[PDB]
Amino acid sequence: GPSVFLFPPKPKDTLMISRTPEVTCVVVDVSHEDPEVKFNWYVDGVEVHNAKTKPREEQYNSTYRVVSVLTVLHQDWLNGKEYKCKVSNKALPAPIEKTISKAKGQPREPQVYTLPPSREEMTKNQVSLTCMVEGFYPSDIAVEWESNGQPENNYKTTPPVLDSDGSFFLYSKLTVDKSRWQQGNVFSCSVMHEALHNHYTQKSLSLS
């Protein structure tokens, strides 16, 4: 029978008041015999009726993908409200209920430090600019880079790792042409996280 996967909103969407966070209830392995799926949504046990079903999508492995999306309020998500999606289908003996919410616990502010490339890397064509983010809870976070008010795309960021004190840390590595570093150009690490003032901080790095 059908399977249900309930996804949280994107951290950026929850943390930016100019974005719209949404939770997604995905049903897969919906048969061609009974494509009819009923959704019931609940916010802290209270049913809501403003969800929207996405266009049904054929998967060509004998199944449909059926998706319901619910807009959530920024503060509701951040205050830890629970979102429950109840899925009913003729092929299911009983309804499937899934639940998501933000991870429980007192939020902790990320400490953000930028580290310059090592002297030993200065022989290479390109250098590594490091954004070290530690002491944050929960693990919902976005990290990006910029220079001269323009986004820098040549970076990779590690998954968050649970630290021994119960917070998380991660590193982001921006790779730049060595000359750009040598020429005194200022680079900046942007971090979005709920426990930051205005969900945001920016830390800068240039050759000193």
Partner: peptide
């Protein structure tokens, strides 16, 4: 006050 990110409003207190 307000935080901005590449000309996009993040949050204000």
């Amino acid at each position: 006050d307000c935080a901005w990110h590449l000309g996009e409003l993040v949050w204000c207190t």
